[PDB]
Amino acid sequence: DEAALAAMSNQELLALGGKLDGVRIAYKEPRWPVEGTKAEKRAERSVAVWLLLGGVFGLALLLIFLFWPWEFKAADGESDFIYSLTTPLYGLTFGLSILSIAIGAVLYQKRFIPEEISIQERHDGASREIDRKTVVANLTDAFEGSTIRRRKLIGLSFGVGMGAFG
Amino acid sequence: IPEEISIQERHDGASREIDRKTVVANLTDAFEGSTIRRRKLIGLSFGVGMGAFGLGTLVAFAGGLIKNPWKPVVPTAEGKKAVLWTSGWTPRYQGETIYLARATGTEDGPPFIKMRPEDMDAGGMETVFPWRESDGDGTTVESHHKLQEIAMGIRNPVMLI
Amino acid sequence: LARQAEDIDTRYHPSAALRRQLNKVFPTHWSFLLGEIALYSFVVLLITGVYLTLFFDPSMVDVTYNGVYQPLRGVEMSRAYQSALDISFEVRGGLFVRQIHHWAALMFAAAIMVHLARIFFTGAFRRPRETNWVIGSLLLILAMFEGYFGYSLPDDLLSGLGLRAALSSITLGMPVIGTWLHWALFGGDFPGTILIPRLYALHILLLPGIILALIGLHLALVWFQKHTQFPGPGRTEHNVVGVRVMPVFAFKSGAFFAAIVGVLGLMGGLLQINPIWNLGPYKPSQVSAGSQPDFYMMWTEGLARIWPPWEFYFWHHTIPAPVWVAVIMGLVFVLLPAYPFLEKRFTGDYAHHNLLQRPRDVPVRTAIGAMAIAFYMVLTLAAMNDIIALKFHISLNATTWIGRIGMVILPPFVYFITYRWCIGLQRSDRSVLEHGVETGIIKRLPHGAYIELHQPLGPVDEHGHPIPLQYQGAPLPKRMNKLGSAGSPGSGSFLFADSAAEDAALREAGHAAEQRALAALREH
Amino acid sequence: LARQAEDIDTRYHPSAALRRQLNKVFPTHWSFLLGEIALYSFVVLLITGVYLTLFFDPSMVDVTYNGVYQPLRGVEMSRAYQSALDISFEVRGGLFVRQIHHWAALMFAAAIMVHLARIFFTGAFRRPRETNWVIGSLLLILAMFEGYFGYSLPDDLLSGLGLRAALSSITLGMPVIGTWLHWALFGGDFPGTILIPRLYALHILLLPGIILALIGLHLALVWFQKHTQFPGPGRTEHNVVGVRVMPVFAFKSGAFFAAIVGVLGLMGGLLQINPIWNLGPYKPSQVSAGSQPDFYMMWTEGLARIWPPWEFYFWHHTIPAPVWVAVIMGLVFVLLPAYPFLEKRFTGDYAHHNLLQRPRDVPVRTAIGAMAIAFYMVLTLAAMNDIIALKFHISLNATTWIGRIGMVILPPFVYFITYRWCIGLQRSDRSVLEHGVETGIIKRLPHGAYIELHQPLGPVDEHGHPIPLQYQGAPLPKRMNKLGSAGSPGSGSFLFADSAAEDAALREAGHAAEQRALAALREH
Numbered sequence A: 001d002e003a004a005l006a007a008m009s010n011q012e013l014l015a016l017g018g019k020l021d022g023v024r025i026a027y028k029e030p031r032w033p034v035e036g037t038k039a040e041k042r043a044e045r046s047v048a049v050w051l052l053l054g055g056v057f058g059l060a061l062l063l064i065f066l067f068w069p070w071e072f073k074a075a076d077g078e079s080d081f082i083y084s085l086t087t088p089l090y091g092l093t094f095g096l097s098i099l100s101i102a103i104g105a106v107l108y109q110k111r112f113i114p115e116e117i118s119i120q121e122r123h124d125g126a127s128r129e130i131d132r133k134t135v136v137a138n139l140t141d142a143f144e145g146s147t148i149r150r151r152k153l154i155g156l157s158f159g160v161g162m163g164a165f166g
Numbered sequence B: 001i002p003e004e005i006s007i008q009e010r011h012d013g014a015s016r017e018i019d020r021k022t023v024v025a026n027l028t029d030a031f032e033g034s035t036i037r038r039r040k041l042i043g044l045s046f047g048v049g050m051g052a053f054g055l056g057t058l059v060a061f062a063g064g065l066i067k068n069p070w071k072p073v074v075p076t077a078e079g080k081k082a083v084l085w086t087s088g089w090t091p092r093y094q095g096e097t098i099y100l101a102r103a104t105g106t107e108d109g110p111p112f113i114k115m116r117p118e119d120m121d122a123g124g125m126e127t128v129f130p131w132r133e134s135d136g137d138g139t140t141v142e143s144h145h146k147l148q149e150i151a152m153g154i155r156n157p158v159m160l161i
Numbered sequence C, D: 001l002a003r004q005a006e007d008i009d010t011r012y013h014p015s016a017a018l019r020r021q022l023n024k025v026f027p028t029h030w031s032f033l034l035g036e037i038a039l040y041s042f043v044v045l046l047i048t049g050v051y052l053t054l055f056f057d058p059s060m061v062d063v064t065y066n067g068v069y070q071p072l073r074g075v076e077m078s079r080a081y082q083s084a085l086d087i088s089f090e091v092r093g094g095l096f097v098r099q100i101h102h103w104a105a106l107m108f109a110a111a112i113m114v115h116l117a118r119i120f121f122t123g124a125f126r127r128p129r130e131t132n133w134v135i136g137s138l139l140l141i142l143a144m145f146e147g148y149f150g151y152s153l154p155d156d157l158l159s160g161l162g163l164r165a166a167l168s169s170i171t172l173g174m175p176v177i178g179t180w181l182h183w184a185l186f187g188g189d190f191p192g193t194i195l196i197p198r199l200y201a202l203h204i205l206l207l208p209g210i211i212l213a214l215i216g217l218h219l220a221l222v223w224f225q226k227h228t229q230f231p232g233p234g235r236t237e238h239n240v241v242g243v244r245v246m247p248v249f250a251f252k253s254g255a256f257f258a259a260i261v262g263v264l265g266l267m268g269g270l271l272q273i274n275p276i277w278n279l280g281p282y283k284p285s286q287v288s289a290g291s292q293p294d295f296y297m298m299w300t301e302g303l304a305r306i307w308p309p310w311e312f313y314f315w316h317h318t319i320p321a322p323v324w325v326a327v328i329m330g331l332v333f334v335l336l337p338a339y340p341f342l343e344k345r346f347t348g349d350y351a352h353h354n355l356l357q358r359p360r361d362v363p364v365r366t367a368i369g370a371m372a373i374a375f376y377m378v379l380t381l382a383a384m385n386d387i388i389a390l391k392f393h394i395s396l397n398a399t400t401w402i403g404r405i406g407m408v409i410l411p412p413f414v415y416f417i418t419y420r421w422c423i424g425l426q427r428s429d430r431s432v433l434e435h436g437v438e439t440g441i442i443k444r445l446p447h448g449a450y451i452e453l454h455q456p457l458g459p460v461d462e463h464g465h466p467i468p469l470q471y472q473g474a475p476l477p478k479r480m481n482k483l484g485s486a487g488s489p490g491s492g493s494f495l496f497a498d499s500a501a502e503d504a505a506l507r508e509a510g511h512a513a514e515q516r517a518l519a520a521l522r523e524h
């Protein structure tokens, strides 16, 4: 616009960027309009417990992998039952850790990031006629300025040579 | 093809001010609409969880390769020693005869034959290997494998002059 | 930081392509994550395969085991089988990793099939996106053959039997080329010395590279031809209603990725898959009642099992029966990528489409798809003839004939039923549009009449009966509770209530918010 | 066809990005193809390696040959060496393909080095392009290691000796970690059973994938941060003077690609490289006077050969002499990508640059580069000590001491001479600016004086002498014939003349065309 586009707030700048991109935001609203309530504290606590569980299970995976008896001991003199838990414990700790982190992230998205609706304005179909005409003119001039239209010997020779080589 | 000259007008340097302002406004609104600036417990929990998961996963991914070089695996006449301290010239049962055998290059029955002092001149050099009678000629599969293990050893060859 | 970002700007100055990609809008429908499932399965497959390549030796030279697994000590095996046994029993974590790998392969195949079903039944393959349909079909074929080559690297008895039968004995029987192809592929007769290294190269380099390139082209086409959407309140053939990338879409995608990795890890740790040590190394003289390749190749096995023995003998020549199986396989592989063009030729519809169809509104195509799924399911059940006959007490000959007759009589029955079922769903929608939503409440009307107390979705006449509405391709509510009717319990947590002031405030805030949301989407 | 183009436009409608990419301008300097050489040799490497993976078995299990090469029948060899012999002697074209592969690897390395030299000496690494410099450095290190792993797969005697010495014995002696790294890489002691399969995986999948990704990022950064150019008549820090992509640049790039493929095919067919059959399979007891890894790794070998034996012994510990080779190699690998930042913090120049510098105008940097090149050349000549002492009659100890002392005394000499040479070139430019181009014609001036008859490049003063011009960062003519002075002979073919009218018409047309080109680029 002009150099005094400064002193313009973040909301107006974001609306301007969206308008340049062809996007429009309807209904972007905060998740907690009321001031401090116990529901918000409970939501934060519930989001944090899942991440703490993920950390606990990652630590458990590390320690189990480091100190569990893993070597093959299968027999029935001294029936092991300890070797047969190694891979199950690996999978349990790994999966539980990363799945707890995932659940925590989903809950944070669902309860603290504001909900929006955006419209994009596809602009689909054929291109603008100016773009079409200009590209076709570029290609047509590149083709007709090479003179190859009237070099049949050269065209046929190129065809034969490339076909033989290929 | 006709000859041409063309000029492009780089349009280089920093971006336009409207572009910079709008990108910064987008990112700033995204960061401060989430309220994450005032959830220290949530930030700390995410940090701890991701750190623990990443460390555990990296240790599990890299732990299968690491091997202890100094574990006793080689039987000798004094227990078991580590590979890098043994040769194949090391005695195994406190008094075993280890000959200096020379290689024939042949595959008939012997690939290694014993040596006597008179089997050489005063200007000769010979490569010798540890024989250990119990290996025998390479007629059977087990003896063939023993002799192959003799020949493929990086501290076995000895120069006798 | 400010300095780093300022320097990145003064050096590369994106600042407009970056904004353009940050403001890209994506629709939020649960069925648009089925391709993400396959993408994430492929990423996990890449990582675990790169791990596995550090321990495998794809050689067919013979050795004696002399390892830790005592029930196999002294047995003559190949170097590939011994490498797989070593991965399983002597690398700390190798069994876990290869089980994750095999589970990720199965999830990859299943996710691809469910995604193909979604695309086909919603019609997202029409005019602008036919090339993307073709690319996806090629990806499906490539994934099938990549998995097949994958589970044949540990040269054990069952996989060797599958290799022998399918690959060798069907290639060998082809009409004219036949043995020439077999010998060009195997270097000679069936058990050679180059097959396992050749398949290892094909499986770790060639097909993964081609699949990565095709996935790149596929996702680029999806990104630049914008996504389709379902008809709805604010939706049009010219816009996209949804959420922008930057804060929300990336967050949801990353969370889904983490969840899928978690599920795969859990089931790769807790469930045993392909225990090659219970088998032995492949040997041409031994066999077991085991059969049935991985489930995505089971329909070919079932076709080979239930096809009748029709052969042809003319002058010093022979055309065996598995040629029929090969022909049907190639015919399916050809007819799959040609469906958009066949359908547009038949229906005479050459328009552009950005809005999706509901499966109930396209009864002929829905019935075609149901018939094809029924045919596939019959062929897949015919592959487990022996397991079914053993567990469910049925005769083996009986199961064979049941499959042989079902393969021809079940798909048209499913077609007929699917057609009538879609039309019935349409009539249900029309009843809900004409009258109101049925509430379930009955009155008695003092002269002794029973009425049902419908609830209208629009304006009523002067006589009270609602005015009928027009269908618009969107779903209609059938339960009163899915509209806000009797909801919002007390605002405690689970055992102790909050204060009444807080409860009322939260209720009013939520009501105002949802009203303004629906207004903002309906008015504009 | 027009209908296909209309369909493409209605479905994807590029029509503006395609125009932006057809109108992109590229400069025309012969030194701008040095990166294209490396690109095309990498493409040839990809194709030939894909071919080679169909026949190679990377196993270390021993067998007996019993092949066609009689002088090797009955010998115990690994499976990798036997598969290499098979590729060479029993596949129609395999030897041709692997010789093309090896020559393409050598050309790849040489072109990377020449391109790095051009970048460094022209200063194209300055402010906006420092990350391109860093990416190129990483590509160089990765290419070195990829080639080194490449020529070790056919497990023969020379490659086994090089592997043993460099890899095993240098890794084993590292101060604290050392043997731990050795055993993690080899699975135990030096000759294991997993080394060749592990290196085969690293060589065909991991390193090629990383190199491909980095080359893609490199080319994208070069495409979007436009190319640099030399100062000239119509060139500015804000424009690009050259040719558009579509008609000319793509055509020239394709022609250069074809020419490079042809050169590589010629020298892969006519020159024998790495005849592994003249060697034998690797065995820990045999050795030959042969040495000297491929030329891009020769400086490490020469450093190991000429470094003095300095070892430390303290309480029950030992630090051997090859730790110096390791330290110096790492020091080079660290100082290579940090040079832009070092030079900018030393000179205090933090500005944007789009115009290049002539190497003569930057004497300190040119001298530093020449000193580094002299160091590299000494370390490379030291690697062929025994070959040089045999062919040219010099003592072996003499050659070792010559290398040891040259390493210290030659690079500063080269620095000094390069500095003075650069200033001399600058002074010759200033001379041709102050006076005219010296024509070489002498006169006698009746009072007995000899003059030289210079030719001015600009305006002339009253006394006939030209006024001095100002340097503008562009080269100046030094020969009269390079300016149009005496040229354009008769216009026949080679043995018969054309007509005078045609000759004159062609002459005048050419003169008018060249003058209009000069004016069109000079005025605006």
Ligand SMILES: CC(C)=CCC/C(C)=C\CC/C(C)=C/CC/C(C)=C/CC/C(C)=C/CC/C(C)=C\CC/C(C)=C\CC/C(C)=C\CC/C(C)=C\CC1=C(C)C(=O)c2ccccc2C1=O
Pocket (backbone or CB within 6 Å): C138, C141, C142, C145, C202, C206, C207, C210, D026, D032, D036, D043, D046, D047, D050, D212, D215, D216, D219, D220, D222, D223, D227, D253
């Ligand atoms: C089809 C199938 C599914 C049906 C069933 C078939 C069957 C049943 C299933 C499969 C079973 C088996 C048998 C199949 C076998 C398949 C087999 C393994 C296929 C393998 C693939 C193949 C053989 C590999 C060889 C081909 C390949 C290696 C060649 C391609 C070359 C590569 C990809 C290009 C790399 C270079 C790239 C990064 C740079 C591109 C060039 C760029 C764009 C321009 C260069 C350039 C740029 C960019 C500048 O900026 C510039 C600036 C200033 C000056 C100059 C330049 C300049 O030149």
Ligand code: HEM
Pocket (backbone or CB within 6 Å): C042, C045, C046, C048, C049, C050, C052, C053, C056, C084, C087, C098, C101, C102, C105, C108, C143, C146, C147, C150, C151, C152, C153, C154, C203, C204, C208, C211, C273, C274, D205
């Ligand atoms: C992309 C689709 C892929 C599919 C469908 C697939 C499938 C499979 C399957 C089912 C197995 C047998 C697992 C078992 O042992 O029970 C396997 C083995 C293997 N895969 Fe993959 N894979 C894929 C990609 C990759 C990639 C990209 C790599 C390497 C970079 C790889 C490396 C390996 C290796 C080395 C084996 C043999 C090791 C073993 O069997 O234990 N795979 N593959």
Ligand code: HEM
Pocket (backbone or CB within 6 Å): C205, D042, D045, D046, D048, D049, D050, D052, D053, D056, D084, D087, D098, D101, D102, D105, D108, D143, D146, D147, D149, D150, D151, D152, D153, D154, D203, D204, D208, D211, D273, D274
């Ligand atoms: C990208 C850079 C590459 C370099 C610098 C390189 C270098 C080398 C060299 C010098 C050899 C020795 C060939 C001989 O004399 O026998 C070799 C062998 C080999 N290369 Fe490459 N290579 C590269 C890429 C590739 C790729 C991409 C593949 C496969 C896709 C490949 C596959 C092979 C194979 C299978 C061998 C062993 C076969 C034989 O020795 O004949 N290479 N490599």
